[PDB]
Structure formats: structure tokens, C-alpha cells
């Protein structure tokens, strides 16, 4: 993780920068939700390093970082509902949410998803908990949402002729 002294930055598009809060009194927070076992659909082997890398990255970046794993869409809203209330937000200049699951068109999926047994956290929902209403310590304060999950079944691509 590469580092510092560039004051060029505070003299660019400044005061359209986000105000950062001093490093001595920060309680910064970040959440990794990552699912690997599922009741019915293919186990996510390799998801560990996703958790690792991201947790070190985040930590390195100046963040205390919670991991929770193997959740329903339920425990996704309820745990995430909790991340909203954590009073360290008041002394934080930002946050990082990350999810890592299987996924469908509509959303991230949870522990139990099949086509007869559906389990989906909408990307809608992530936003509706973490806003000025439900998470008020975070206004005028950036929040990035990092979703590692499949968006649907199609491979990425179209053919062209050369």
C-alpha cells in the first residue's frame, strides 16, 4: 500500500474534497459480508482470499474492519442494520461496505437460495439502510459499497468480425 506527501492534492479541486478527519482521534469502521457455504448452490471456493485481501486492504487504509460470513438475506439486513448504529460512525470520515456472494439479476444472494428457495438482498436495500435517514452519523460523508457477486448467468460477451 503506497503512501503520502502530496499536498498537490489539497490544492486541486479542493473544498470539493471530502474533509478528512485527523488520524489520532479516528474510529473508522468497515464491513465485509462474505458468503461461502450455501444450502443448495455451488460452494464459493476461493472466497477466503477475497475476505483476507479486502480486510488487509481496508485495515491498511485506516479502518477497523468487521467480518461476517455465511448469512441469510435476513442476517444481512439485521447485521447491516447494526452496522448503521455503531457509534464509532460519529467519529468517522467515511465507510466501506463490501459484499461477496453468489448473485442474481435483482440482488446479492444469501445462505439458502435456490429457484424454489429464494434468498436475495437487493442493492436497493443496502442503500436504504445506509442513508441519512437510517444511518444519520454518515451524512456529507462518503460510503463505498463493493459488491463481489454475479449479476446473472450470461458470459460477458458479443462476437465481432476481423
Amino acid at each position: 500500500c503506497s503512501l503520502e506527501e502530496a499536498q498537490r492534492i489539497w490544492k486541486q479541486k479542493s473544498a470539493e474534497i471530502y474533509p478528512i478527519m485527523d488520524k489520532s482521534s479516528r474510529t473508522r469502521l468497515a464491513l465485509i459480508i462474505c458468503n461461502e457455504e450455501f444450502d443448495s448452490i455451488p460452494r464459493r471456493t476461493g472466497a477466503e482470499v477475497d475476505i483476507t485481501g479486502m480486510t488487509m486492504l481496508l485495515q491498511n487504509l485506516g479502518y477497523s474492519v468487521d467480518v461476517k460470513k455465511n448469512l441469510t438475506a435476513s442476517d444481512m439486513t439485521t447485521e447491516l442494520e447494526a452496522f448503521a448504529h455503531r457509534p464509532e460512525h460519529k467519529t468517522s470520515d467515511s465507510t466501506f461496505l463490501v459484499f461477496m456472494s453468489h448473485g442474481i439479476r435483482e440482488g446479492i444472494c444469501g445462505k439458502k437460495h435456490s429457484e424454489q428457495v429464494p434468498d436475495i438482498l437487493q442493492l436497493n436495500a443496502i442503500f436504504n439502510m445506509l442513508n441519512t435517514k437510517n444511518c444519520p452519523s454518515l451524512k456529507d460523508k462518503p460510503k463505498v459499497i463493493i459488491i463481489q457477486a454475479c449479476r446473472g448467468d450470461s458470459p460477458g460477451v458479443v462476437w465481432f468480425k476481423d
Binding site: 472466497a47 477475497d50 486492504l57 441519512t132 463481489q148
Partner: protein
């Protein structure tokens, strides 16, 4: 005593693929999206800001390899530059 605030501001989502389409994740090396995110976060963290950095990683997927996927940025409501001053 009672003023108004925007209910939605300061967000940015970053996903692994575009809609309808898939995300790769290699067995012993994690998600190719995760790997790449991390790599770019390290080197560009304060050369650049998060809109920029998230652009860059999108760029690095562009000419399709065998397991193609284009990262997308939904629903950014950042009003200001998120420079991430690593070490302050």
C-alpha cells in the same frame, strides 16, 4: 431548529460485472475482481481519488480475456472528490 438534508448523498457502489453478466472467481486465487481492486487500491490510493481509481480498474478488464467481465459503478452520489490520503 429544523433544517433539511438530502436523503441520498455521498454513495458509490462498485460491482464486479455489468447487469445480466457474470463474475469470475478462481479457486486458488480469489475473485479476479477482488484481486484487481486491491492491486489498484494500493498503487493509486493517493495518486488519485475513488472515482478515478474505480475508472482505472474498469479499464484493466477491457480487451476480453477468456474470462471476461466489465466492472460497473452504479449509483454514485459522491458530491466531492474522495481522495483517500493513506497515512493521515
Amino acid at each position: 431548529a429544523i433544517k433539511k438534508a438530502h436523503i441520498e448523498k455521498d454513495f458509490i457502489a462498485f460491482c464486479s460485472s455489468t447487469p445480466d453478466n457474470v463474475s469470475w472467481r478462481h479457486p486458488t486465487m480469489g475473485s479476479v475482481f477482488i484481486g484487481r481492486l486491491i492491486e489498484h487500491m494500493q498503487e493509486y490510493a493517493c495518486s488519485c481519488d475513488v472515482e478515478e481509481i474505480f475508472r482505472k480498474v474498469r479499464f484493466s478488464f477491457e480487451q476480453p480475456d477468456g474470462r471476461a467481465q466489465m466492472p460497473t459503478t452504479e449509483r454514485v452520489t459522491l458530491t466531492r472528490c474522495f481522495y483517500l490520503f493513506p497515512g493521515h
